[PDB]
Ligand binder design. Structure first.
Ligand SMILES: [Zn+2]
Lengths: 112, 97, 131, 135, 58
């Protein structure tokens, strides 16, 4: 039933300073400031959370290996699997349509 | 009509409803005709068109949405594409439809 | 022919808060049914909305200040036409000229012989050009 | 007709080699005991050759034209078949169901496919197969 | 047991909230008996459409 308060300069209940109450090895209750939770990286096309990539603070990514923040597939770590599949299919079909349109133009200009 | 032929095919013939089944049957070469609803997404429609060109399967563009095509087939759910494995008793294949 | 000037909307003021036709539409796209936009795209959307709002305000002001000038010029032209008709003293145009003068006079500082009854004749009861 | 037969060029849409170009060597429509689905053995390009200009010479040209191959078992649902074809007569015997249960056979198959691909590229044939797809 | 937010609100904001509620009630009671307080929709209905006004003129 012991009351605890902030341990830093800020006296206001702002998002920046949030308090948890913990029992120290001295048998007493004491406050502890909690950091902001990390946010999962999101896909750049659909905005869904990327799978297989660890969730860390922006500056904590500078200290981990590349396998913990990428995926072995192309666009891995930036776009998800379904978006890459759509990109591949769309690019191939667009190229095929360009070929067909070029053949049609060649035929229609071949009359004269 | 075209709805009567489709209903007869579902009653007596062999069919596959849906995009995945249609593509699988196109790969296996067992499709005689693919009816495509007008409500289908453009990417899937273009993929089906390319697959039909590869497999030399006749294409019929249904004049209605996936729900109208589902009702024409006789099912209370939407179907986006139908593939006719066997006409059976009907004559949809004979009349170039 | 001369009766078409009676239909000039620019020479009409209606009640400031007139009821218009019933138009119903979604006030906004639902929050859970939005399309994903990149941070660059969202910033560009904010910028173009800010541009569009000020363009809308400026267009409103310009239309407001041009309607009055157009109304003045049209009043001058219409009154010149009416007065020159009156000076010409054409027996077949007196009623229309008087009706126009009565209608648009406050904006300033025989049915068998005519064809093609004026627009909205079912609701526009002629004040001066009666049968 | 059927279009997923030997020699048909396909584009992989799923997996590490997504977007890479492969050629089908042996289609299995009924699948296998270890792969109970309609799959195909394919030989594809993992590292496309780089373009060579007149400025490059000798050793540099030999470096740029190297091709890294790969051999894979791919489900049909993870392939996008093309209308193009490429001859697989050179290496239709090394890529089989057994090859993927013995790593040494995998090594030999990759060696053979690399040699065949480099020879075909240097012959000037199949310029579309040896070009990267931009997606 | 009273919640913390309830205690804080009742100690801080209860009095002026109640006073404002009373003020709105008094103003509503005073304005109810007066003439000339109509909403935008009500005034639009009263004025009517352009066709209704042209009928009223005729
Ligand atoms: Zn995505």
């Amino acid at each position: 039933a012991q009351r605890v308060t902030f341990r830093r300069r800020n006296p206001y209940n702002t998002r920046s300073n949030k308090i948890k109450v913990v029992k120290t090895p001295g048998g007493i209750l004491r406050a502890q400031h909690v950091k902001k939770l990390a946010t999962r990286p999101k896909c750049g096309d659909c905005g869904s959370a990327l799978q297989g990539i660890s969730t860390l603070r922006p500056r904590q990514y500078a200290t981990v290996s590349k396998t913990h923040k990428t995926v072995s597939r192309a666009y891995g770590g930036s776009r998800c699997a379904n978006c890459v599949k759509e990109r591949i299919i769309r690019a191939f079909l667009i190229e095929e349509q360009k070929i067909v349109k070029k053949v049609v133009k060649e035929q229609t200009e071949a009359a004269k | 009509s075209i709805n009567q032929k489709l209903a007869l095919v579902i009653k007596s013939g062999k069919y596959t409803l849906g995009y995945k089944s249609t593509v699988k049957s196109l790969r296996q070469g067992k499709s005689k005709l693919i009816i495509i609803a007008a409500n289908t997404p453009v990417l899937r429609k273009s993929e089906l068109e390319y697959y039909a060109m590869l497999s030399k399967t006749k294409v019929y563009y249904f004049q209605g949405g996936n729900n109208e095509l589902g009702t024409a087939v006789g099912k209370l759910f939407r179907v986006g594409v139908v593939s006719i494995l066997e006409a059976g008793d009907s004559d949809i294949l004979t009349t170039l439809a | 022919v001369l009766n078409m000037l009676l239909s000039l909307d620019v020479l009409h003021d209606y009640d400031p808060n007139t009821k218009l036709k019933g138009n119903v539409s979604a006030p906004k796209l639902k929050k859970k049914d939005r399309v994903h936009l990149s941070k660059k795209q969202r910033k560009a959307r904010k910028e173009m909305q800010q541009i569009e709002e000020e363009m809308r305000n400026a267009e409103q002001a310009v239309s407001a200040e041009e309607r009055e000038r157009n109304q003045s010029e049209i009043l001058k032209i219409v009154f010149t036409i009416y007065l020159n008709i009156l000076k010409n003293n054409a027996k077949t145009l007196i009623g229309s000229v008087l009706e126009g003068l009565t209608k648009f006079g406050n904006m300033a500082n025989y049915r068998s012989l005519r064809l093609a009854d004026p627009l909205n004749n079912e609701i526009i009861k002629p004040s001066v050009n009666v049968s | 007709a059927k279009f997923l037969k030997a020699g048909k060029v396909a584009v992989v849409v799923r997996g590490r080699y997504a977007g890479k170009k492969v050629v089908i060597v042996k289609p299995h429509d009924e699948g296998s005991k270890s792969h109970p689905f309609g799959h195909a053995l394919v030989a594809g390009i993992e590292r496309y050759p780089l373009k060579v200009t007149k400025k490059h010479g000798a050793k540099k040209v030999a470096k740029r034209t190297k091709i890294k191959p790969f051999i894979k078992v791919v489900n049909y649902n993870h392939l996008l078949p093309t209308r193009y074809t490429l001859d697989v007569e050179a290496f239709k015997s090394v890529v089989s169901t057994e090859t993927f249960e013995q790593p040494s056979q995998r090594e030999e198959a990759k060696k053979v496919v690399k040699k065949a691909f480099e020879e075909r590229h240097q012959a000037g044939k199949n310029q579309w197969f040896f070009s990267k797809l931009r997606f | 047991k009273v919640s913390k937010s309830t205690k804080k609100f009742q100690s801080k904001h209860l009095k002026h909230t109640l006073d404002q509620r009373r003020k709105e009630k008094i103003q509503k009671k005073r304005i109810q008996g007066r003439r000339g307080n109509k909403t935008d929709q009500e005034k639009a209905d009263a004025a009517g459409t352009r066709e209704q006004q042209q009928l009223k003129k005729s």
